[PDB]
Design a protein around this motif. Sequence first.
Motif, PDB file in Angstrom:
ATOM      1  N   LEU A  45       0.867  -1.166   0.000  1.00  0.00           N
ATOM      2  CA  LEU A  45       0.000   0.000   0.000  1.00  0.00           C
ATOM      3  C   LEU A  45       0.917   1.232   0.000  1.00  0.00           C
ATOM      4  CD1 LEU A  45      -2.644   1.406   0.011  1.00  0.00           C
ATOM      5  CD2 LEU A  45      -2.847   0.970   2.486  1.00  0.00           C
ATOM      6  N   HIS A  46       0.897   1.963  -1.107  1.00  0.00           N
ATOM      7  CA  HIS A  46       1.669   3.195  -1.262  1.00  0.00           C
ATOM      8  C   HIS A  46       0.771   4.421  -1.311  1.00  0.00           C
ATOM      9  CE1 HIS A  46       5.267   0.852  -2.708  1.00  0.00           C
ATOM     10  NE2 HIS A  46       4.302   0.011  -3.040  1.00  0.00           N
ATOM     11  N   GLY A  47       1.392   5.592  -1.226  1.00  0.00           N
ATOM     12  CA  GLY A  47       0.703   6.841  -1.497  1.00  0.00           C
ATOM     13  C   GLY A  47      -0.240   7.267  -0.391  1.00  0.00           C
ATOM     14  N   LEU A  48       0.051   6.832   0.833  1.00  0.00           N
ATOM     15  CA  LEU A  48      -0.773   7.182   1.989  1.00  0.00           C
ATOM     16  C   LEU A  48      -0.602   8.639   2.393  1.00  0.00           C
ATOM     17  CD1 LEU A  48      -0.528   3.925   4.090  1.00  0.00           C
ATOM     18  CD2 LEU A  48      -2.524   4.903   2.951  1.00  0.00           C
ATOM     19  N   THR A  49       0.577   9.205   2.163  1.00  0.00           N
ATOM     20  CA  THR A  49       0.844  10.567   2.616  1.00  0.00           C
ATOM     21  C   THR A  49       1.901  11.278   1.776  1.00  0.00           C
ATOM     22  OG1 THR A  49       1.210  11.903   4.626  1.00  0.00           O
ATOM     23  CG2 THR A  49       2.711  10.039   4.254  1.00  0.00           C
ATOM     24  N   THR A  50       2.028  12.583   1.991  1.00  0.00           N
ATOM     25  CA  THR A  50       3.055  13.380   1.330  1.00  0.00           C
ATOM     26  C   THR A  50       4.055  13.860   2.375  1.00  0.00           C
ATOM     27  OG1 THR A  50       1.734  15.390   1.578  1.00  0.00           O
ATOM     28  CG2 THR A  50       1.461  14.125  -0.448  1.00  0.00           C
ATOM     29  N   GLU A  51       5.215  14.333   1.930  1.00  0.00           N
ATOM     30  CA  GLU A  51       6.215  14.856   2.856  1.00  0.00           C
ATOM     31  C   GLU A  51       5.737  16.078   3.641  1.00  0.00           C
ATOM     32  OE1 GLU A  51      10.039  15.723   1.192  1.00  0.00           O
ATOM     33  OE2 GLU A  51      10.742  16.796   2.975  1.00  0.00           O
ATOM     34  N   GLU A  52       5.005  16.981   2.993  1.00  0.00           N
ATOM     35  CA  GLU A  52       4.501  18.165   3.692  1.00  0.00           C
ATOM     36  C   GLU A  52       3.479  17.818   4.769  1.00  0.00           C
ATOM     37  OE1 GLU A  52       5.177  18.476  -0.668  1.00  0.00           O
ATOM     38  OE2 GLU A  52       3.491  17.632   0.463  1.00  0.00           O
ATOM     39  N   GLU A  53       2.686  16.786   4.504  1.00  0.00           N
ATOM     40  CA  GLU A  53       1.604  16.391   5.403  1.00  0.00           C
ATOM     41  C   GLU A  53       2.094  15.507   6.552  1.00  0.00           C
ATOM     42  OE1 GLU A  53      -2.979  14.767   4.854  1.00  0.00           O
ATOM     43  OE2 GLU A  53      -1.304  13.652   3.963  1.00  0.00           O
ATOM     44  N   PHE A  54       3.156  14.747   6.297  1.00  0.00           N
ATOM     45  CA  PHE A  54       3.628  13.729   7.224  1.00  0.00           C
ATOM     46  C   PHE A  54       4.530  14.367   8.257  1.00  0.00           C
ATOM     47  CE2 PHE A  54       5.855   9.419   7.796  1.00  0.00           C
ATOM     48  CZ  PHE A  54       4.923   9.044   8.739  1.00  0.00           C
ATOM     49  N   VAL A  55       3.928  15.120   9.167  1.00  0.00           N
ATOM     50  CA  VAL A  55       4.697  15.846  10.163  1.00  0.00           C
ATOM     51  C   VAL A  55       5.086  14.956  11.328  1.00  0.00           C
ATOM     52  CG1 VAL A  55       3.767  18.119   9.571  1.00  0.00           C
ATOM     53  CG2 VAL A  55       2.585  16.695  11.257  1.00  0.00           C
TER      54      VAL A  55
END
Lengths: 115, 110, 115, 110
Positions: A45-55
């Motif tokens: 399962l990929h694409g769960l989050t982005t770098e900006e969102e994954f704080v």
Amino acid sequence: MLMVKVLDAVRGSPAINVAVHVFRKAADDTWEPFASGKTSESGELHGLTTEEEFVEGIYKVEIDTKSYWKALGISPFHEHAEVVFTANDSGPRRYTIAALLSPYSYSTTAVVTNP
Amino acid sequence: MLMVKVLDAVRGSPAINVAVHVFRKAADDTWEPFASGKTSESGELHGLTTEEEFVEGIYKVEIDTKSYWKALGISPFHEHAEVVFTAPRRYTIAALLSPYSYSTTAVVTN
Amino acid sequence: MLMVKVLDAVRGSPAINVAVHVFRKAADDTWEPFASGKTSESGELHGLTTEEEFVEGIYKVEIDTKSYWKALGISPFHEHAEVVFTANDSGPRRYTIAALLSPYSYSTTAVVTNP
Amino acid sequence: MLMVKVLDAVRGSPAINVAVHVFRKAADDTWEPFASGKTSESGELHGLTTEEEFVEGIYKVEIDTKSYWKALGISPFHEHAEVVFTAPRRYTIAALLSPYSYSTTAVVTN
């Protein structure tokens, strides 16, 4: 930056169509829904989050192991598998959460690499 | 001083009546038979050796996992499971079995 | 068609530079050297064999776990990890042999898919 | 009827003095405290419940793995390990710990 991989130890195959829910612990100590999906034919399962969102924070990954075994006609022991961890406390990492499933046992491993 | 415990991760139970064979590496480079047995109703195998006979050396524990799964009508992947180690020391060798995966752990105490 | 992947459960990373030796059981019940290599920075070892060469038989994969831990300054329990299996008895498959290493424990899993 | 056993895969030993908390899912949807303790020198925790109090239901066993690794001076990945299950039945919940990986197995006997 967050990937989930699920394997089936009874069949020696990827675990396909397993529901996965990700939560982030809020400032008030509650679990906020963060992302969800189902594993692909490769058990990933990929694409769960982005770098900006994954704080930075504490995240919980809940894997619906019970539904998976029920659909194979097996009554399993666990209700689900969950993995709870602090993420990103010293900078951004790529996180791979792997789970290996048997009806009365599971294993979970984290691989953390620096992008 | 050497104990083997085998668990079945599919049925959530001790793995019963599993054959185990133990070898010691000989002066040359051969494995000479040392002890063997079958696990009990609790999935354990005790009384394989004595403190006098269990001298320093390299030992191999071979677990017949294949025959275990076949008896249950499940096709397994591995021919067997082997644990090879140098030999405090009460040694518990644990193995947790699934048809396409196994894990083995040593608990070593004094 | 045969791949080996090694993970380190103490560090949460791929196991890099682990020696791997593959043998095939000969007609006389001896182990013939079949292939060898070392895991890459992703903890993987590819290109051990070809489809024409990878015939039906019993194969043994021996992973040098001992040298790996020694180089980290840790005295491990096992001399090595070996995985022995019948391959290809009902036609060609892709085989992934995964190992997860701790000093006093290891896990090995096989994933078998149809190309 | 409910027993917890915790092993350390790094040192090859029982995981000693690990905190364990057990919960039961309440009529509503809340987890109400049910039992707790710390593992013994053998990495085991017994006497959490009685056959009378251990009724059918959903239970959660929470193992404080993080505090265990910190005491050893190792940085762990997980905040804790949780095992959630519906409740024959003597239940042994085993957990095998490494800093970035754990496994849990249930042995259920009659």
